[PDB]
Design an enzyme around this catalytic site. Structure first.
Site, short mmCIF file in Angstrom:
data_model
loop_
_atom_site.label_atom_id
_atom_site.label_comp_id
_atom_site.label_asym_id
_atom_site.label_seq_id
_atom_site.Cartn_x
_atom_site.Cartn_y
_atom_site.Cartn_z
N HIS B 49 0.82 -1.19 0.00
CA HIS B 49 0.00 0.00 0.00
C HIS B 49 0.87 1.26 0.00
CE1 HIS B 49 -2.66 3.08 1.65
NE2 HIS B 49 -3.46 2.58 0.71
N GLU B 52 2.27 2.06 -3.47
CA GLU B 52 1.27 2.69 -4.31
C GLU B 52 1.30 4.21 -4.15
OE1 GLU B 52 -2.82 1.43 -3.50
OE2 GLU B 52 -3.46 3.17 -4.72
N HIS B 53 1.45 4.72 -2.91
CA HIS B 53 1.63 6.16 -2.68
C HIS B 53 2.89 6.70 -3.34
CE1 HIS B 53 -1.46 7.06 0.56
NE2 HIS B 53 -1.56 5.74 0.37
N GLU B 129 -4.80 8.14 7.21
CA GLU B 129 -5.73 7.23 6.55
C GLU B 129 -6.27 6.18 7.52
OE1 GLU B 129 -3.28 5.98 3.17
OE2 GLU B 129 -5.08 6.23 1.94
#
Ligand SMILES: CCCCCCCCCCCCCCCCCC(=O)OC[C@H](COP(=O)([O-])OCC(O)COP(=O)([O-])OC[C@@H](COC(=O)CCCCCCCCCCCCCCCCC)OC(=O)CCCCCCCCCCCCCCCCC)OC(=O)CCCCCCCCCCCCCCCCC
Ligand SMILES: CCCCCCCCCCCCCCCCCC(=O)OC[C@H](COP(=O)([O-])OCC[N+](C)(C)C)OC(=O)CCCCCCCCCCCCCCCCC
Ligand SMILES: CCCCCCCCCCCCCCCCCC(=O)OC[C@H](COP(=O)([O-])OCC[N+](C)(C)C)OC(=O)CCCCCCCCCCCCCCCCC
Ligand SMILES: CCCCCCCCCCCCCCCCCCCC(=O)O[C@H](COC(=O)CCCCCCCCCCCCCC)COP(=O)(O)OCCN
Ligand code: HEM
Ligand code: HEM
Ligand SMILES: CCCCCCCCCCCCCC(=O)OC[C@H](COP(=O)([O-])O)OC(=O)CCCCCCCCCCCCC
Ligand SMILES: CCCCCC[C@H]1C(=O)O[C@H](C)[C@H](NC(=O)c2cccc(NC=O)c2O)C(=O)O[C@@H](C)[C@@H]1OC(=O)CC(C)C
Ligand SMILES: CCCCCCCCCCCCO[C@@H]1O[C@H](CO)[C@@H](O[C@H]2O[C@H](CO)[C@@H](O)[C@H](O)[C@H]2O)[C@H](O)[C@H]1O
Ligand SMILES: CCCCCCCCCCCCO[C@@H]1O[C@H](CO)[C@@H](O[C@H]2O[C@H](CO)[C@@H](O)[C@H](O)[C@H]2O)[C@H](O)[C@H]1O
Lengths: 63, 438, 124, 383, 54, 75
Positions: B49, B52-53, B129
């Protein structure tokens, strides 16, 4: 402690073969045995108890 | 009859798969990867994850600003998502902007900077998040559902990962993750819409030729999950709507019961009080729920992974004193998949699915997602004719046999969130998984 | 019996010339001797209401019809407990004995019966 | 909040006897329910008192009843009250059931109180049958013998069941002592079922003579129906007074003042009057098992009224043809009662068969036909 | 285990039938076993043991 | 081109139809067996049950053929 996605530790209790038919069957064997003895015990109880209503020994003696 | 999906390979083992549509003017191209959060361990959980950023935070050539400008100049957009077993990076553009977009994707995947400064900046974004998914109730419910069903297993981990890992993810571990997992034999370059296959293969040879191959190339969609019957209760009396998910272990992508599980799922179906047609649906559960106002909605699901799946239902309800009725009637409808379903329900559900599986694919992104998912889970695109044949082979006997081994008297994973005082304890829910009358 | 059944059978009879010639006079005498009009009722006020279908049809009545029905029930209840009959304007005249409820219940039942049929459809 | 509503125990009583919302137009046929409660209270009070002086052993039973009549202070009253109230209990129960059939009280949404009511009626019959045996006079013994021998008709096991019921090979001491214990018990069971049928009723409330909803116009149970019930309590007590004090043996059989004698058979063995219609139905069928089934079916068939009544309207107030049929049904049931105590002789044999056919055809043919036709007449007649 | 579960346990009708059949067999065999055991621990004491003299 | 969906209504009554009921027929069978075994077990003590049913079963049936010696019987 804080994250609710970290499941608390259940390893002291978890069975490895929890999804198997053998696992379920064992517990149903216990439930079944208990139902079996309860049925046999009920039948004995009902039969012996209700027999009080059949002719008593003194009535059968005069027959 | 839709155009044929063309498929080619490169030497490294990268698959190229395309479906042209000369009626549209846009094209979706992207890279579907057979890797996701499942490939992490407990120490680097959250890496996929995190990457992906950072993929959009600048490359060896273009900086973050230059990257922004380049995409803005193309005119379309870029998008990415990471799941448990799949990562996707795609680009929707105009017909003639496809070579630009392939070039940008190849760059962000192969040649991303992962600079310590950018790592540190994102570490706060991702931390935030963690405290804002809390609002997305459906996601909360499904993340807890995986966590409990696959207790202490890789499928049980979240995608975001724990707070602790977010603070300790280094560029080293990021680089290691994408070097081990983003290999050519695990990647599919997919084009849908206004793309020429032969053009796409040339672009792949130009940009994705220097991708590493893995040491041991297994086929695409190659995986042992041990499901745990269990419950998570997240009671919150201040919420007006209860959210409840109930699932059993379901089927993998390549299970022989894959279509039988989809048909069974369609017999229960979905319901939403806000849709006008929902009060008239054929589904028995839908009729019970709408007539008695038991729920705002329910959605049946059959989620698949490479080696397991979850099959169940997700309910939302404001009727806090009749949650017991809602769950009771839901599980009694599941019981009927084992005891009562006949050709009546099965043929109806098959009719609905034959269309549904085709209907879903109504734009270039949907088509690309379909090609990419199928190639990364099955190793091939299954033609509509093959799908129509597999659905036709599902009989009522198959549904009953499947339900009797998968649902009947089985352990469930249960998650409730919100005003769930009316949700009974585990035993009373699980006792509804069989009928004493049968 | 369903209102649907009663209405359809009656329509079969009203179609047949012979049947109507013999049934309509009997039905009119029956209604006169029934004597519900002497308590100020309309025929439809007597229909059993404690069913889901009938409760739905009663909820669909226009508010005016609904308020007037309430009054006729209360007025008949007061005649019943007093052992009196309506007089004058309280007596229902034959022209006032309108089937205000029949259309609502026929629509409720039409849906209910279609639902039952469609629950039993077989894809051919 | 008032204590009567706040306290859960008081609130249950409140719900049944005080705030209970009732239709405002119940007629005097709604008084039989409280008369039946009165009969039950009298039977409990008199019955428990008789049990303090009665001896259930066959060597002493008949004499203990004479001791009650002759030596126990007011024993004559307590015995005559108990014996006559048993008859009044059946008059009230037939009136109550007659009201329920005429007014459509068995229709939805009151099927469940009606169905529990049918069981209450069966329990009353068994209770009264056993109580009558306890005197151990000629009719006690011989009525027990013939009624218990009906069980012999049960195929295969029937004879065994009879010997088991008797506790021996004929009606004797074992039978009498068990009938005493069961006679004492059965009224408590009956009180429970009476309460159950009222709890079941409380969901829809009482019906009313018009057959329409009363949700538009309710009256509290107290004071309106409390004071209306007192009128018939005193009317009942006046009837009770005339039998118990002035004609205490009018409803009885003289043979029950002869001690039971297994050798001598009484001229005619007949049930108590309230069982006579069922006895005529049994006689009508020549087969033994046939007759037993018909007799049971004559009561159990009440359970199908909610199905065979096809009317869209509740009750008979506005149904001239149904009213005529009901009148014939009632008078036929009384004629069956009279035929239950005639001798098995011409022409009563054939008459009993025709009346039996009419009894069953009311449920199976006539009511479904008449109710169907009246539906059509209401619709066409009011077009 | 699957086979056994499927035949005797899965359907409650079959489970109850199997429990009742087992209860019947238990009842008959237990009777016989207790009778024999009771006779052995009380050997020489019962009427059946001395009856032969008379 | 298809103008109309292709279907029929199956006969039904009180919300039961033949396809559904037919799935339950074997279950009624097993319940009937359960009730039969249960009932017979309840009256196994009844002498007529032994005489007429149980003693006639092959092999097993001798379990129920038991005679009191005339020397031990007061009646
Ligand atoms: C036993 C224990 C003793 C307690 C006695 C309780 C009995 C009370 C009862 O229920 O009946 C009284 C009862 C009076 O009750 P009500 O509440 O005034 O009217 C009830 C009727 O629905 C009202 O019926 P209606 O208003 O149509 O009036 C009819 C009635 C006239 O009723 C009158 O009282 C007048 O007259 C007759 O039907 C007689 C028939 C003609 C024969 C000639 O008498 C009857 O009406 C009997 C009619 C039955 C045939
Ligand atoms: C007192 C008499 C007792 C009679 C019990 C005899 C057999 C019933 C029994 O054991 O119940 C098991 C059964 C089933 O137990 P269960 O509910 O644990 O099993 C259901 C799940 N399957 C069918 C997959 C095993 O219980 C009943 O049917 C209730 C009756 C009990 C009384
Ligand atoms: C004997 C035959 C009786 C016939 C009754 C016919 C109706 C009638 O005139 O009754 C007056 C009344 C008529 O009352 P109603 O309620 O129909 O009418 C009141 C007046 N109007 C129409 C203006 C609203 O009927 C009753 O009250 C009937 C109660 C029946 C009780 C029967 C007891 C018999 C027991 C045997 C049990 C088995
Ligand atoms: C002999 C026994 C019967 C006689 C007792 C009745 C009461 C005697 C007079 C008392 C009285 O009238 O006052 C009322 C008391 O009644 C009451 O509170 C009771 C009203 C009726 C008495 C019993 C109700 C019977 C209903 C069911 C019968 C059941 C039979 C089964 C055994 C209260 O007057 P108010 O309360 O109207 O207010 C008025 C303002 N305080
Ligand atoms: C529904 C309630 C009851 C009914 C219908 C009923 C009916 C009867 C009947 C018909 C008799 C025969 C009376 C005679 O001719 O002498 C009788 C006798 C008797 N009953 Fe009841 N009874 C009831 C409740 C009770 C109760 C609760 C008891 C408590 C023990 C009881 C005790 C007796 C006794 C001791 C006798 C025998 C003495 C006698 O004949 O008077 N009864 N009963
Ligand atoms: C011990 C015997 C009984 C007692 C004490 C009893 C008592 C009552 C009472 C107090 C009521 C409400 C007031 C009334 O309508 O009269 C009632 C209503 C009712 N009872 Fe009974 N009852 C008895 C036996 C029966 C029997 C044998 C039946 C049916 C076969 C029956 C069926 C009903 C029905 C259907 C109602 C509702 C009637 C209505 O309001 O429309 N009951 N009972
Ligand atoms: C000994 C104990 C006996 C317990 C017996 C239980 C029998 C219950 C049978 C039953 O429920 O059948 C249901 C079946 C119709 O199915 P559905 O419409 O309820 O799905 O109904 C019909 O098929 C009719
Ligand atoms: C003390 C609280 C106990 C609650 C039950 C006690 C009794 C009870 O409920 O009383 C009420 C007074 C009831 N009458 C009515 O409903 C009623 C309703 C409408 C109209 C009339 N009359 C019209 O003109 C009524 O009379 C009645 O008589 O029923 C008895 C049978 C009940 O006895 C029991 O079930 C328990 C046991 C003693 C049998
Ligand atoms: C709904 C239930 C169905 C009906 C219930 C049946 C009621 C009566 C049935 C049988 C009662 C008598 O049945 C009889 O009972 C007694 C025990 O009770 C048994 O007798 C057996 O055990 C007793 C002690 O337990 C010993 O003294 C005796 O020597 C031995 O034979 C008989 O073997 C059986 O024939
Ligand atoms: C001699 C009999 C022995 C004692 C038994 C007492 C009477 C029987 C009561 C048991 C029934 C209780 O069952 C339940 O009770 C509650 C509590 O009042 C009642 O409740 C009823 O009255 C209350 C207020 O008075 C209302 O708010 C409610 O809408 C209504 O249903 C009903 O009656 C029934 O729904």
């Amino acid at each position: 402690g804080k994250s609710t996605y970290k499941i608390p530790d259940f390893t002291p209790y978890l069975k490895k073969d929890r999804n198997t038919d053998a696992n379920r069957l064992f517990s149903y064997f216990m439930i079944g045995s208990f139902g079996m003895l309860s049925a046999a015990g009920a039948k004995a109880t009902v039969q012996d108890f209700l027999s009080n209503m059949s002719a008593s020994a003194d009535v059968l003696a005069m027959a | 009859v839709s155009p044929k999906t063309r498929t080619s390979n490169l030497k490294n083992g990268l698959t190229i798969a395309s479906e042209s549509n000369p009626l549209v003017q846009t094209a979706t191209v992207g890279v579907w990867i057979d890797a996701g959060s499942r490939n992490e361990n407990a120490y680097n959980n959250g890496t996929a994850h995190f990457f992906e950023h950072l993929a959009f935070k600048g490359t060896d050539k273009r900086s973050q600003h230059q990257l922004e400008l380049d995409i803005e100049n193309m005119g379309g957009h870029l998008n990415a998502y990471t799941s448990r077993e799949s990562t996707v990076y795609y680009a929707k553009s105009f017909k003639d902007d496809v070579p630009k977009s392939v070039e940008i994707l190849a760059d962000i995947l192969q040649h991303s900077k992962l600079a310590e400064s950018a790592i540190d900046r994102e570490r706060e974004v991702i931390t935030r998040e963690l405290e804002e998914v809390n609002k997305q109730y459906e996601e909360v419910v499904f993340d807890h559902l995986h966590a409990t069903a696959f207790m202490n297993q890789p499928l049980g981990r979240t995608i975001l990962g724990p707070r602790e890992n977010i603070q300790t993810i280094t560029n080293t571990e990021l680089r290691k993750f994408i070097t081990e997992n983003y290999t050519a034999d695990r990647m599919v370059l997919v084009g849908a819409g206004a793309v020429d296959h032969d053009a796409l293969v040339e672009l792949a040879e130009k940009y994705f030729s220097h991708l590493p191959s893995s040491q041991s190339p297994v086929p695409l969609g190659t995986p042992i999950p041990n499901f745990v019957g269990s419950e998570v209760r997240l009671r919150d009396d201040t919420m007006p709507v209860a959210h409840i998910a109930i699932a059993v272990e379901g089927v993998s992508w390549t299970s022989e019961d894959y279509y039988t599980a989809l048909v069974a799922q369609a017999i229960i179906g979905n319901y939403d009080r806000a849709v006008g047609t929902s009060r008239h649906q054929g589904s028995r559960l839908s009729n019970i729920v709408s007539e008695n106002n038991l729920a705002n909605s329910f959605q049946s699901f059959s989620t698949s992974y490479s080696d397991t799946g979850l099959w169940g239902i997700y309910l939302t309800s404001e009727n806090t004193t009749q949650i017991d009725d809602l769950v009771h009637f839901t599980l009694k409808e599941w019981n009927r998949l084992s005891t009562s379903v006949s050709n009546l329900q099965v043929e109806r559900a098959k009719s609905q699915l034959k269309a549904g599986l085709l209907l879903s694919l109504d734009g270039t992104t949907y088509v690309a997602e379909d090609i990419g998912r199928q190639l990364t889970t099955l190793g091939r695109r299954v033609t509509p004719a093959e799908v129509e044949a597999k659905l036709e082979a599902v009989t009522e006997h198959d549904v009953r046999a499947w339900a009797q081994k998968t649902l009947y008297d089985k352990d469930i994973a249960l998650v409730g969130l919100g005003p769930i005082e009316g949700l009974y304890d585990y035993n009373r829910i699980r006792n509804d998984m069989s009928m004493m009358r049968w | 019996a369903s209102i649907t059944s009663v209405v359809k059978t009656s329509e079969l009879i009203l179609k047949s010339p012979l049947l109507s010639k013999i049934v309509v006079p009997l039905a009119k005498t029956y209604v006169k001797f029934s004597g519900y009009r002497q308590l100020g009722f309309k025929m439809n006020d007597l229909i059993i209401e404690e069913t889901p279908n009938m409760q739905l049809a009663l909820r669909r009545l226009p508010p005016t019809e609904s308020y007037d029905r309430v009054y006729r029930l209360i007025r008949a209840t007061q005649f019943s407990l007093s052992h009196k009959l309506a007089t004058g304007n309280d007596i229902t005249k034959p022209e006032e004995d309108d089937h205000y409820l029949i259309p609502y219940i026929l629509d409720v039942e039409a849906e209910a019966f279609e639902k039952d049929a469609l629950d039993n459809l077989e894809v051919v | 909040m008032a204590l009567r509503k706040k306290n859960s125990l008081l609130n249950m009583a409140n719900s049944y006897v005080l705030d209970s919302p009732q239709p405002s137009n119940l007629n005097y046929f709604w008084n039989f329910g409280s008369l039946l409660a009165l009969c039950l209270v009298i039977q409990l009070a008199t019955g428990i008192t008789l049990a303090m002086h009665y001896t259930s052993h066959a060597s002493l039973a008949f004499d203990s009843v004479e001791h009650i009549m002759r030596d126990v202070n007011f024993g004559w009253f307590i015995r005559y009250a108990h014996a006559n109230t048993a008859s009044f209990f059946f008059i009230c129960i037939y009136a109550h059931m007659g009201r329920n059939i005429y007014y459509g009280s068995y229709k939805t949404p009151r099927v469940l109180p009606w169905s529990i009511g049918v069981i209450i009626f069966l329990l009353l019959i068994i209770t009264a049958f056993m109580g009558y045996v306890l005197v151990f006079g000629q009719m006690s013994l011989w009525g027990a013998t013939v009624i218990c021998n009906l069980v012999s008709a049960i195929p295969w096991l029937g004879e065994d069941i009879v010997h088991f019921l008797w506790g021996g090979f004929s009606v004797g001491n074992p039978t009498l002592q068990r009938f005493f214990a069961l006679h004492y018990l059965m009224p408590f069971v009956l009180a429970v079922f009476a309460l159950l049928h009222l709890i079941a009723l409380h969901t829809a409330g009482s019906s009313n003579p018009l057959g329409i909803t009363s949700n538009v116009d309710k009256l509290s149970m107290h004071p309106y129906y409390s004071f209306k019930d007192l009128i018939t309590v005193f009317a009942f007590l006046l009837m009770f007074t005339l039998f118990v004090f002035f004609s205490p043996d009018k409803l009885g059989h003289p043979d029950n003042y002869i001690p039971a004698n297994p050798m001598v058979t009484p001229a005619s063995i007949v049930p108590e009057w309230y069982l006579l219609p069922f006895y005529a139905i049994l006689r009508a069928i020549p087969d033994k098992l046939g007759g037993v089934i018909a007799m049971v079916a004559a009561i159990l068939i009440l359970l199908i009224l909610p199905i065979v009544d096809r009317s869209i309207i509740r009750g008979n107030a506005f149904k001239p043809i149904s009213k005529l049929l009901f009148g014939f049904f009632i008078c036929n049931f009384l004629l069956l009662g009279v035929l239950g105590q005639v001798h098995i002789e011409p022409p009563f044999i054939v008459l009993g068969q025709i009346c039996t056919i009419f009894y069953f055809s009311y449920f199976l043919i006539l009511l479904p036909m008449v109710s169907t036709i009246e539906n059509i007449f209401f619709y066409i007649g009011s077009l | 285990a699957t086979t056994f579960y499927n035949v005797f346990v899965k359907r409650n009708s079959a489970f109850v039938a199997t429990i009742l059949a087992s209860a019947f067999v238990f009842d008959m065999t237990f009777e016989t076993a207790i009778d024999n055991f009771w006779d052995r621990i009380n050997a020489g004491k019962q009427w059946k043991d001395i009856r032969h003299k008379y | 081109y298809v103008k109309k969906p292709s279907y029929k209504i199956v006969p039904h009554f009180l919300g039961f139809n033949i396809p559904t009921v037919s799935k339950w027929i074997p279950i009624f069978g097993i319940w009937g067996a359960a009730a039969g075994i249960g009932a017979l077990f309840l009256i196994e003590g009844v002498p007529r049950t032994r005489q007429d049913i149980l003693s006639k079963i092959p092999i097993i049936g001798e379990h129920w053929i038991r005679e009191i010696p005339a020397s031990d019987n007061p009646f």
